[PDB]
Symmetry: C3
Subunit: 164 residues, 3 copies
Protein backbone atom coordinates (compact mmCIF):
# COMPACT_ATOMS: atom_id res chain seq x y z
CA UNK A 1 0.00 0.00 0.00
CA UNK A 2 1.66 3.18 -1.28
CA UNK A 3 -0.97 5.69 -0.12
CA UNK A 4 -1.37 8.05 2.86
CA UNK A 5 -4.82 8.65 4.36
CA UNK A 6 -5.77 12.31 4.85
CA UNK A 7 -8.88 13.27 6.84
CA UNK A 8 -10.38 16.76 6.83
CA UNK A 9 -12.07 17.70 10.11
CA UNK A 10 -13.97 20.80 8.93
CA UNK A 11 -14.94 23.06 6.01
CA UNK A 12 -12.07 25.35 7.10
CA UNK A 13 -9.56 22.58 6.32
CA UNK A 14 -7.90 22.07 2.93
CA UNK A 15 -6.13 19.21 1.14
CA UNK A 16 -2.31 19.52 1.35
CA UNK A 17 -0.81 20.03 -2.12
CA UNK A 18 2.75 19.21 -3.19
CA UNK A 19 4.44 21.93 -5.26
CA UNK A 20 6.60 20.00 -7.76
CA UNK A 21 7.20 16.34 -8.71
CA UNK A 22 10.65 16.01 -7.08
CA UNK A 23 9.66 18.11 -4.04
CA UNK A 24 9.65 16.52 -0.58
CA UNK A 25 7.07 18.59 1.29
CA UNK A 26 3.28 18.76 1.26
CA UNK A 27 2.27 22.40 1.77
CA UNK A 28 0.01 22.60 4.83
CA UNK A 29 -2.78 25.20 4.88
CA UNK A 30 -4.10 27.16 7.86
CA UNK A 31 -7.69 26.55 8.98
CA UNK A 32 -7.97 29.81 10.95
CA UNK A 33 -7.18 33.52 10.81
CA UNK A 34 -5.01 34.36 13.84
CA UNK A 35 -3.13 37.51 14.91
CA UNK A 36 0.13 36.85 16.77
CA UNK A 37 1.57 39.58 19.00
CA UNK A 38 5.34 39.90 19.63
CA UNK A 39 6.59 36.89 21.64
CA UNK A 40 3.07 35.36 21.57
CA UNK A 41 2.97 31.57 21.28
CA UNK A 42 0.09 29.61 19.77
CA UNK A 43 -0.91 26.34 18.13
CA UNK A 44 -2.35 26.94 14.65
CA UNK A 45 -5.04 24.34 13.94
CA UNK A 46 -5.00 22.79 10.45
CA UNK A 47 -8.23 20.81 10.94
CA UNK A 48 -6.37 18.08 9.05
CA UNK A 49 -5.74 14.61 10.51
CA UNK A 50 -3.35 12.16 8.83
CA UNK A 51 -2.26 8.54 9.40
CA UNK A 52 1.45 7.80 8.98
CA UNK A 53 2.22 4.06 8.53
CA UNK A 54 4.50 2.27 11.02
CA UNK A 55 8.22 2.70 10.37
CA UNK A 56 7.80 6.34 9.31
CA UNK A 57 7.57 9.84 10.81
CA UNK A 58 5.96 13.10 9.66
CA UNK A 59 7.84 16.39 9.90
CA UNK A 60 5.32 19.23 10.20
CA UNK A 61 7.97 21.86 9.55
CA UNK A 62 8.49 25.51 8.55
CA UNK A 63 8.26 26.79 4.98
CA UNK A 64 11.51 28.50 3.93
CA UNK A 65 9.77 31.49 2.32
CA UNK A 66 7.83 32.57 5.41
CA UNK A 67 10.53 31.62 7.97
CA UNK A 68 13.21 33.71 6.22
CA UNK A 69 10.96 36.73 5.58
CA UNK A 70 9.02 36.88 8.88
CA UNK A 71 9.76 36.47 12.60
CA UNK A 72 7.29 33.54 12.66
CA UNK A 73 9.09 30.53 14.15
CA UNK A 74 7.67 27.04 13.62
CA UNK A 75 8.97 24.28 15.88
CA UNK A 76 9.14 21.22 13.62
CA UNK A 77 6.53 18.68 14.71
CA UNK A 78 7.39 14.98 14.79
CA UNK A 79 4.07 13.39 13.82
CA UNK A 80 4.14 9.84 15.22
CA UNK A 81 3.06 6.89 13.08
CA UNK A 82 -0.53 6.22 14.15
CA UNK A 83 -1.40 9.69 15.45
CA UNK A 84 -4.90 10.36 14.12
CA UNK A 85 -5.38 13.75 15.79
CA UNK A 86 -5.59 17.30 14.46
CA UNK A 87 -2.20 18.46 13.17
CA UNK A 88 -1.27 21.61 15.09
CA UNK A 89 1.46 23.99 13.97
CA UNK A 90 3.71 24.94 16.89
CA UNK A 91 4.19 28.66 16.18
CA UNK A 92 5.95 31.59 17.88
CA UNK A 93 6.18 35.20 16.73
CA UNK A 94 9.77 35.74 17.88
CA UNK A 95 9.75 39.49 17.08
CA UNK A 96 11.06 41.85 19.79
CA UNK A 97 8.43 43.26 22.13
CA UNK A 98 9.94 46.77 22.22
CA UNK A 99 6.65 48.24 23.54
CA UNK A 100 6.25 50.39 20.39
CA UNK A 101 2.93 50.46 18.51
CA UNK A 102 1.93 50.91 14.86
CA UNK A 103 -1.30 51.13 12.82
CA UNK A 104 -0.15 48.49 10.30
CA UNK A 105 -0.44 44.74 10.79
CA UNK A 106 1.98 42.45 8.90
CA UNK A 107 1.28 39.33 6.80
CA UNK A 108 3.31 36.17 6.09
CA UNK A 109 5.33 38.10 3.48
CA UNK A 110 6.27 40.86 5.97
CA UNK A 111 4.13 43.41 4.10
CA UNK A 112 2.15 46.24 5.72
CA UNK A 113 -1.56 45.38 5.77
CA UNK A 114 -3.92 47.77 3.96
CA UNK A 115 -6.81 47.97 6.43
CA UNK A 116 -9.50 50.53 5.62
CA UNK A 117 -10.64 50.54 9.26
CA UNK A 118 -7.89 52.03 11.43
CA UNK A 119 -6.61 50.12 14.49
CA UNK A 120 -3.60 50.18 16.82
CA UNK A 121 -1.41 47.07 16.96
CA UNK A 122 1.88 46.12 18.65
CA UNK A 123 5.03 46.57 16.54
CA UNK A 124 5.94 43.30 14.83
CA UNK A 125 2.51 41.67 14.90
CA UNK A 126 1.69 39.10 12.21
CA UNK A 127 -1.54 37.68 10.75
CA UNK A 128 -2.06 34.16 9.47
CA UNK A 129 -5.01 33.95 7.07
CA UNK A 130 -7.33 30.97 6.51
CA UNK A 131 -6.26 28.68 3.65
CA UNK A 132 -2.74 30.11 3.77
CA UNK A 133 0.38 27.96 3.39
CA UNK A 134 2.53 28.52 6.49
CA UNK A 135 4.02 25.06 7.05
CA UNK A 136 4.76 21.83 5.14
CA UNK A 137 4.73 18.08 5.83
CA UNK A 138 7.74 15.89 5.01
CA UNK A 139 7.43 12.13 5.62
CA UNK A 140 10.74 10.35 6.36
CA UNK A 141 11.38 6.65 7.22
CA UNK A 142 12.59 5.88 10.76
CA UNK A 143 14.44 3.08 12.56
CA UNK A 144 13.34 1.92 16.02
CA UNK A 145 15.23 -1.09 17.44
CA UNK A 146 15.51 -2.72 20.88
CA UNK A 147 17.82 -1.18 23.51
CA UNK A 148 19.97 -2.73 26.26
CA UNK A 149 22.36 -1.40 28.92
CA UNK A 150 26.04 -1.88 28.08
CA UNK A 151 29.11 -1.12 30.21
CA UNK A 152 31.14 -0.45 27.05
CA UNK A 153 30.33 -0.52 23.33
CA UNK A 154 31.02 -3.07 20.56
CA UNK A 155 35.37 6.03 16.66
CA UNK A 156 34.90 9.80 16.99
CA UNK A 157 35.60 9.56 20.73
CA UNK A 158 33.38 11.56 23.08
CA UNK A 159 33.13 14.67 20.88
CA UNK A 160 30.05 19.86 20.40
CA UNK A 161 32.40 21.45 17.85
CA UNK A 162 35.72 19.66 18.33
CA UNK A 163 36.84 21.47 15.17
CA UNK A 164 35.76 25.01 14.22
CA UNK B 1 21.89 -6.73 14.09
CA UNK B 2 18.66 -4.87 14.88
CA UNK B 3 19.68 -3.41 18.26
CA UNK B 4 20.99 -0.04 19.50
CA UNK B 5 23.54 0.08 22.33
CA UNK B 6 22.69 2.48 25.18
CA UNK B 7 25.26 3.28 27.88
CA UNK B 8 24.40 5.03 31.15
CA UNK B 9 27.23 7.19 32.50
CA UNK B 10 25.88 7.77 36.03
CA UNK B 11 23.18 6.99 38.61
CA UNK B 12 21.50 10.26 37.55
CA UNK B 13 20.95 8.83 34.05
CA UNK B 14 17.86 6.88 32.98
CA UNK B 15 16.98 4.46 30.18
CA UNK B 16 15.08 6.19 27.32
CA UNK B 17 11.55 4.79 27.00
CA UNK B 18 9.37 4.84 23.89
CA UNK B 19 5.75 5.90 24.51
CA UNK B 20 3.72 3.76 22.06
CA UNK B 21 4.40 0.94 19.56
CA UNK B 22 4.03 3.05 16.39
CA UNK B 23 5.80 6.08 17.93
CA UNK B 24 9.08 7.31 16.43
CA UNK B 25 10.80 8.96 19.40
CA UNK B 26 12.58 7.67 22.48
CA UNK B 27 11.79 10.04 25.36
CA UNK B 28 15.08 11.36 26.77
CA UNK B 29 15.31 12.08 30.50
CA UNK B 30 17.26 14.86 32.22
CA UNK B 31 20.15 13.88 34.51
CA UNK B 32 20.25 17.22 36.35
CA UNK B 33 18.05 19.87 37.97
CA UNK B 34 18.81 23.21 36.27
CA UNK B 35 17.22 26.67 36.49
CA UNK B 36 17.27 28.65 33.24
CA UNK B 37 16.94 32.44 33.37
CA UNK B 38 15.38 34.44 30.50
CA UNK B 39 17.61 34.23 27.39
CA UNK B 40 20.01 31.90 29.26
CA UNK B 41 21.59 29.17 27.12
CA UNK B 42 22.82 25.83 28.47
CA UNK B 43 23.61 22.23 27.57
CA UNK B 44 21.49 19.82 29.62
CA UNK B 45 23.50 16.65 30.31
CA UNK B 46 21.62 13.35 29.92
CA UNK B 47 24.50 11.19 31.20
CA UNK B 48 23.43 8.82 28.41
CA UNK B 49 25.78 7.73 25.61
CA UNK B 50 24.48 5.88 22.54
CA UNK B 51 26.02 4.27 19.44
CA UNK B 52 24.20 4.85 16.15
CA UNK B 53 25.20 2.37 13.39
CA UNK B 54 26.72 3.65 10.12
CA UNK B 55 24.19 4.87 7.56
CA UNK B 56 21.95 6.42 10.23
CA UNK B 57 21.56 9.64 12.25
CA UNK B 58 20.02 10.44 15.65
CA UNK B 59 17.75 13.45 16.09
CA UNK B 60 17.93 14.60 19.72
CA UNK B 61 14.93 16.88 19.31
CA UNK B 62 12.26 18.81 21.23
CA UNK B 63 9.16 17.23 22.75
CA UNK B 64 5.98 18.84 21.37
CA UNK B 65 4.29 19.12 24.79
CA UNK B 66 7.04 21.16 26.46
CA UNK B 67 8.01 23.20 23.36
CA UNK B 68 4.43 24.41 22.77
CA UNK B 69 3.70 25.16 26.44
CA UNK B 70 7.02 26.71 27.53
CA UNK B 71 9.58 29.16 26.11
CA UNK B 72 12.19 26.37 26.29
CA UNK B 73 13.78 26.02 22.84
CA UNK B 74 15.69 22.85 21.97
CA UNK B 75 17.97 23.00 18.93
CA UNK B 76 17.63 19.55 17.34
CA UNK B 77 20.90 17.64 17.70
CA UNK B 78 22.23 15.57 14.81
CA UNK B 79 23.89 12.67 16.63
CA UNK B 80 26.52 11.28 14.24
CA UNK B 81 26.84 7.53 13.67
CA UNK B 82 29.72 6.49 15.93
CA UNK B 83 29.52 9.31 18.47
CA UNK B 84 29.98 7.60 21.84
CA UNK B 85 29.89 10.76 23.97
CA UNK B 86 27.39 12.16 26.46
CA UNK B 87 24.22 13.31 24.69
CA UNK B 88 23.72 16.99 25.53
CA UNK B 89 20.44 18.81 24.99
CA UNK B 90 21.03 22.18 23.30
CA UNK B 91 18.56 24.34 25.25
CA UNK B 92 17.60 28.03 25.34
CA UNK B 93 14.98 29.74 27.50
CA UNK B 94 13.79 32.16 24.81
CA UNK B 95 11.49 34.09 27.19
CA UNK B 96 11.75 37.91 27.12
CA UNK B 97 14.13 39.42 29.66
CA UNK B 98 11.84 42.34 30.55
CA UNK B 99 13.78 42.99 33.80
CA UNK B 100 10.67 42.19 35.90
CA UNK B 101 10.91 39.79 38.86
CA UNK B 102 8.52 37.31 40.50
CA UNK B 103 8.52 34.94 43.50
CA UNK B 104 7.31 31.97 41.43
CA UNK B 105 9.53 29.71 39.34
CA UNK B 106 7.98 27.84 36.39
CA UNK B 107 8.22 24.15 35.42
CA UNK B 108 8.13 22.33 32.05
CA UNK B 109 4.32 22.63 32.03
CA UNK B 110 4.42 26.43 32.53
CA UNK B 111 2.94 26.10 36.04
CA UNK B 112 3.82 28.30 39.02
CA UNK B 113 6.10 26.42 41.42
CA UNK B 114 4.85 25.95 44.99
CA UNK B 115 8.02 26.65 46.99
CA UNK B 116 7.58 26.83 50.77
CA UNK B 117 10.82 28.81 51.08
CA UNK B 118 10.37 32.22 49.44
CA UNK B 119 12.86 33.44 46.82
CA UNK B 120 13.04 36.11 44.10
CA UNK B 121 13.49 34.95 40.50
CA UNK B 122 13.52 36.63 37.08
CA UNK B 123 10.20 36.70 35.21
CA UNK B 124 9.98 33.74 32.82
CA UNK B 125 12.50 31.47 34.54
CA UNK B 126 12.11 27.70 34.08
CA UNK B 127 13.29 24.63 36.01
CA UNK B 128 14.22 21.27 34.53
CA UNK B 129 14.02 18.48 37.12
CA UNK B 130 16.12 15.30 37.26
CA UNK B 131 14.54 12.31 35.51
CA UNK B 132 12.22 14.61 33.58
CA UNK B 133 11.37 14.08 29.90
CA UNK B 134 12.32 17.27 28.04
CA UNK B 135 13.59 15.90 24.71
CA UNK B 136 13.29 12.78 22.53
CA UNK B 137 15.53 10.75 20.20
CA UNK B 138 14.44 9.86 16.65
CA UNK B 139 16.77 7.68 14.56
CA UNK B 140 16.48 8.20 10.78
CA UNK B 141 18.49 6.56 7.93
CA UNK B 142 20.84 8.82 5.96
CA UNK B 143 22.53 8.83 2.54
CA UNK B 144 26.15 9.94 2.16
CA UNK B 145 27.64 9.57 -1.36
CA UNK B 146 30.78 10.87 -3.10
CA UNK B 147 30.86 14.45 -4.43
CA UNK B 148 32.52 16.02 -7.49
CA UNK B 149 32.68 19.52 -9.00
CA UNK B 150 30.45 19.99 -12.05
CA UNK B 151 30.14 23.01 -14.36
CA UNK B 152 26.50 22.12 -15.04
CA UNK B 153 24.19 19.32 -13.84
CA UNK B 154 22.98 16.07 -15.46
CA UNK B 155 13.78 21.09 -12.83
CA UNK B 156 12.52 23.62 -10.27
CA UNK B 157 15.03 26.19 -11.57
CA UNK B 158 16.95 28.24 -9.02
CA UNK B 159 14.03 28.76 -6.61
CA UNK B 160 12.82 30.74 -1.01
CA UNK B 161 9.05 30.96 -1.50
CA UNK B 162 8.57 31.31 -5.26
CA UNK B 163 4.87 30.83 -4.55
CA UNK B 164 3.07 32.14 -1.44
CA UNK C 1 24.44 6.08 -9.42
CA UNK C 2 25.78 6.65 -5.89
CA UNK C 3 27.10 10.21 -6.37
CA UNK C 4 25.81 13.72 -5.59
CA UNK C 5 26.56 16.59 -7.98
CA UNK C 6 27.98 19.73 -6.35
CA UNK C 7 28.32 22.98 -8.33
CA UNK C 8 30.35 25.97 -7.13
CA UNK C 9 28.95 29.31 -8.29
CA UNK C 10 31.95 31.52 -7.46
CA UNK C 11 35.56 31.72 -6.21
CA UNK C 12 34.11 32.56 -2.77
CA UNK C 13 32.46 29.12 -2.63
CA UNK C 14 34.12 26.01 -1.19
CA UNK C 15 33.60 22.24 -1.48
CA UNK C 16 31.65 20.82 1.50
CA UNK C 17 33.81 18.40 3.51
CA UNK C 18 32.59 15.59 5.75
CA UNK C 19 34.36 15.37 9.12
CA UNK C 20 34.55 11.61 9.84
CA UNK C 21 33.66 8.36 8.04
CA UNK C 22 30.55 7.53 10.09
CA UNK C 23 29.41 11.19 10.25
CA UNK C 24 26.11 12.21 8.65
CA UNK C 25 26.68 15.87 7.80
CA UNK C 26 28.65 17.70 5.13
CA UNK C 27 30.08 20.87 6.70
CA UNK C 28 28.87 23.86 4.68
CA UNK C 29 31.17 26.88 4.32
CA UNK C 30 30.19 30.55 4.16
CA UNK C 31 30.89 32.47 0.94
CA UNK C 32 30.66 35.91 2.56
CA UNK C 33 31.73 37.92 5.60
CA UNK C 34 28.57 39.28 7.27
CA UNK C 35 27.94 41.14 10.54
CA UNK C 36 24.61 40.31 12.21
CA UNK C 37 23.14 42.78 14.70
CA UNK C 38 20.88 41.64 17.59
CA UNK C 39 17.57 40.28 16.20
CA UNK C 40 18.83 40.84 12.62
CA UNK C 41 17.72 38.21 10.10
CA UNK C 42 19.63 37.34 6.93
CA UNK C 43 20.23 34.67 4.31
CA UNK C 44 23.90 33.65 4.21
CA UNK C 45 24.85 32.75 0.63
CA UNK C 46 27.02 29.63 0.21
CA UNK C 47 27.52 30.10 -3.55
CA UNK C 48 27.08 26.31 -3.67
CA UNK C 49 24.35 24.61 -5.72
CA UNK C 50 23.59 20.89 -5.31
CA UNK C 51 21.28 18.35 -6.98
CA UNK C 52 19.50 15.91 -4.67
CA UNK C 53 18.11 12.83 -6.49
CA UNK C 54 14.36 12.08 -6.39
CA UNK C 55 13.17 10.27 -3.26
CA UNK C 56 15.55 12.23 -1.01
CA UNK C 57 15.75 15.54 0.89
CA UNK C 58 18.65 17.74 2.03
CA UNK C 59 18.72 19.19 5.54
CA UNK C 60 20.77 22.40 5.50
CA UNK C 61 20.92 22.54 9.29
CA UNK C 62 22.78 24.10 12.23
CA UNK C 63 26.17 22.93 13.48
CA UNK C 64 26.00 21.93 17.16
CA UNK C 65 29.22 23.75 18.11
CA UNK C 66 28.15 27.19 16.89
CA UNK C 67 24.45 26.85 17.84
CA UNK C 68 25.25 25.96 21.47
CA UNK C 69 27.97 28.60 21.90
CA UNK C 70 26.40 31.55 20.04
CA UNK C 71 22.96 33.16 19.71
CA UNK C 72 23.07 32.39 15.96
CA UNK C 73 19.91 30.47 15.07
CA UNK C 74 19.76 28.51 11.81
CA UNK C 75 16.32 27.44 10.59
CA UNK C 76 16.91 23.99 9.07
CA UNK C 77 16.42 24.16 5.30
CA UNK C 78 14.58 21.38 3.49
CA UNK C 79 16.42 21.28 0.16
CA UNK C 80 13.99 19.74 -2.35
CA UNK C 81 15.13 17.01 -4.74
CA UNK C 82 15.84 18.85 -8.00
CA UNK C 83 16.51 22.32 -6.57
CA UNK C 84 19.55 23.57 -8.49
CA UNK C 85 19.71 27.02 -6.88
CA UNK C 86 22.15 28.67 -4.49
CA UNK C 87 21.90 27.11 -1.02
CA UNK C 88 21.07 29.90 1.43
CA UNK C 89 21.47 29.56 5.18
CA UNK C 90 18.39 30.89 7.00
CA UNK C 91 20.07 32.69 9.91
CA UNK C 92 18.92 34.84 12.85
CA UNK C 93 21.03 36.43 15.58
CA UNK C 94 18.53 35.82 18.40
CA UNK C 95 20.54 37.82 20.97
CA UNK C 96 18.61 40.39 23.05
CA UNK C 97 18.60 43.92 21.67
CA UNK C 98 19.05 45.60 25.07
CA UNK C 99 20.19 48.87 23.40
CA UNK C 100 23.64 48.59 25.03
CA UNK C 101 26.80 49.04 22.95
CA UNK C 102 30.34 47.62 23.08
CA UNK C 103 33.63 48.02 21.18
CA UNK C 104 34.08 44.26 20.70
CA UNK C 105 32.47 42.21 17.94
CA UNK C 106 31.93 38.47 18.52
CA UNK C 107 32.78 35.48 16.30
CA UNK C 108 31.18 32.04 15.83
CA UNK C 109 32.93 30.83 19.01
CA UNK C 110 31.51 33.71 21.11
CA UNK C 111 34.98 35.26 21.51
CA UNK C 112 35.72 38.99 21.65
CA UNK C 113 37.21 40.16 18.35
CA UNK C 114 40.68 41.74 18.48
CA UNK C 115 40.25 44.67 16.08
CA UNK C 116 43.17 47.11 15.92
CA UNK C 117 40.88 49.80 14.50
CA UNK C 118 38.33 50.81 17.15
CA UNK C 119 34.60 50.79 16.34
CA UNK C 120 31.29 50.84 18.23
CA UNK C 121 28.95 47.87 17.76
CA UNK C 122 25.64 46.74 19.29
CA UNK C 123 25.89 44.34 22.25
CA UNK C 124 25.59 40.74 21.04
CA UNK C 125 26.65 41.29 17.43
CA UNK C 126 28.24 38.36 15.57
CA UNK C 127 30.48 38.04 12.50
CA UNK C 128 30.46 35.19 10.00
CA UNK C 129 33.75 34.98 8.08
CA UNK C 130 34.26 33.74 4.51
CA UNK C 131 35.14 30.04 4.25
CA UNK C 132 33.81 29.44 7.77
CA UNK C 133 31.77 26.37 8.71
CA UNK C 134 28.47 27.59 10.16
CA UNK C 135 26.02 24.96 8.88
CA UNK C 136 25.99 21.36 7.61
CA UNK C 137 24.09 19.31 5.01
CA UNK C 138 22.43 15.99 5.92
CA UNK C 139 20.73 14.02 3.13
CA UNK C 140 17.86 11.78 4.27
CA UNK C 141 15.51 9.55 2.17
CA UNK C 142 11.85 10.60 1.98
CA UNK C 143 8.49 8.97 1.21
CA UNK C 144 5.90 10.78 -0.92
CA UNK C 145 2.74 8.76 -1.74
CA UNK C 146 -0.70 9.62 -3.16
CA UNK C 147 -3.37 11.13 -0.87
CA UNK C 148 -7.16 10.76 -0.75
CA UNK C 149 -9.96 12.13 1.46
CA UNK C 150 -11.31 9.62 3.98
CA UNK C 151 -14.24 9.99 6.40
CA UNK C 152 -12.52 7.62 8.84
CA UNK C 153 -9.21 5.73 8.80
CA UNK C 154 -8.30 2.08 8.07
CA UNK C 155 -4.09 3.76 17.89
CA UNK C 156 -2.73 6.66 19.97
CA UNK C 157 -6.12 8.41 19.73
CA UNK C 158 -6.14 12.14 19.03
CA UNK C 159 -3.14 13.00 21.25
CA UNK C 160 0.66 17.55 22.48
CA UNK C 161 2.08 16.00 25.65
CA UNK C 162 -0.61 13.59 26.85
CA UNK C 163 1.98 12.38 29.36
CA UNK C 164 4.56 14.64 31.05
O1 LIG D 1 22.28 18.56 20.60
C1 LIG D 1 23.31 17.87 20.44
C2 LIG D 1 24.07 18.01 19.28
C3 LIG D 1 25.21 17.23 19.11
N1 LIG D 1 25.59 16.36 20.07
C4 LIG D 1 26.79 15.54 19.90
C5 LIG D 1 26.54 14.43 18.88
C6 LIG D 1 27.38 14.80 17.67
O2 LIG D 1 28.06 13.66 17.16
C7 LIG D 1 28.37 15.84 18.16
C8 LIG D 1 28.53 17.02 17.20
O3 LIG D 1 27.88 16.80 15.95
P1 LIG D 1 27.70 17.96 14.85
O4 LIG D 1 28.58 17.60 13.55
O5 LIG D 1 26.27 18.05 14.47
N2 LIG D 1 28.23 19.50 15.48
P2 LIG D 1 29.87 20.03 15.23
O6 LIG D 1 30.27 19.82 13.68
O7 LIG D 1 29.99 21.46 15.59
O8 LIG D 1 30.85 19.15 16.16
P3 LIG D 1 32.13 18.39 15.54
O9 LIG D 1 32.84 19.44 14.73
O10 LIG D 1 32.89 17.93 16.77
O11 LIG D 1 31.53 17.27 14.72
O12 LIG D 1 27.90 16.31 19.43
C9 LIG D 1 24.79 16.25 21.24
O13 LIG D 1 25.11 15.45 22.15
N3 LIG D 1 23.69 17.00 21.38
O1 LIG E 1 17.43 27.18 4.29
C1 LIG E 1 17.12 26.99 3.10
C2 LIG E 1 15.83 26.59 2.77
C3 LIG E 1 15.50 26.39 1.44
N1 LIG E 1 16.41 26.58 0.47
C4 LIG E 1 16.06 26.37 -0.95
C5 LIG E 1 15.95 24.88 -1.24
C6 LIG E 1 14.47 24.63 -1.48
O2 LIG E 1 14.28 23.79 -2.62
C7 LIG E 1 13.86 26.00 -1.73
C8 LIG E 1 12.53 26.21 -0.99
O3 LIG E 1 12.04 25.00 -0.41
P1 LIG E 1 10.79 24.97 0.60
O4 LIG E 1 9.55 24.20 -0.10
O5 LIG E 1 11.18 24.26 1.84
N2 LIG E 1 10.28 26.60 1.00
P2 LIG E 1 9.03 27.38 0.06
O6 LIG E 1 7.79 26.37 -0.12
O7 LIG E 1 8.59 28.60 0.76
O8 LIG E 1 9.63 27.77 -1.38
P3 LIG E 1 8.89 27.33 -2.74
O9 LIG E 1 7.46 27.75 -2.55
O10 LIG E 1 9.63 28.11 -3.81
O11 LIG E 1 9.10 25.84 -2.80
O12 LIG E 1 14.81 26.97 -1.28
C9 LIG E 1 17.72 26.99 0.83
O13 LIG E 1 18.60 27.18 -0.03
N3 LIG E 1 18.03 27.18 2.13
O1 LIG F 1 3.90 20.37 15.87
C1 LIG F 1 3.26 19.35 16.20
C2 LIG F 1 3.85 18.40 17.03
C3 LIG F 1 3.13 17.27 17.39
N1 LIG F 1 1.87 17.09 16.94
C4 LIG F 1 1.10 15.89 17.31
C5 LIG F 1 1.63 14.67 16.56
C6 LIG F 1 2.29 13.81 17.61
O2 LIG F 1 1.94 12.44 17.45
C7 LIG F 1 1.80 14.33 18.96
C8 LIG F 1 2.90 14.47 20.00
O3 LIG F 1 4.13 13.87 19.57
P1 LIG F 1 5.51 14.06 20.38
O4 LIG F 1 5.96 12.65 21.01
O5 LIG F 1 6.55 14.55 19.45
N2 LIG F 1 5.31 15.21 21.69
P2 LIG F 1 4.88 14.65 23.28
O6 LIG F 1 5.83 13.42 23.69
O7 LIG F 1 5.06 15.76 24.25
O8 LIG F 1 3.34 14.19 23.28
P3 LIG F 1 2.91 12.73 23.82
O9 LIG F 1 3.58 12.61 25.17
O10 LIG F 1 1.40 12.81 23.88
O11 LIG F 1 3.45 11.78 22.77
O12 LIG F 1 1.20 15.61 18.71
C9 LIG F 1 1.30 18.08 16.09
O13 LIG F 1 0.14 17.95 15.65
N3 LIG F 1 2.01 19.16 15.75
MG1 LIG G 1 7.59 24.31 -0.61
MG1 LIG H 1 6.51 11.66 22.70
MG1 LIG I 1 30.00 18.26 12.25
NI1 LIG J 1 13.98 35.72 20.98
NI1 LIG K 1 14.65 19.41 12.16
Amino acid sequence: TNTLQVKLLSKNARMPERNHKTDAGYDIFSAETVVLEPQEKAVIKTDVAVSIPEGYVGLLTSRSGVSSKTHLVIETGKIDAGAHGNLGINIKNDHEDDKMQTIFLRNIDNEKIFEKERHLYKLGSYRIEKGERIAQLVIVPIWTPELKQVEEFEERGEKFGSSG
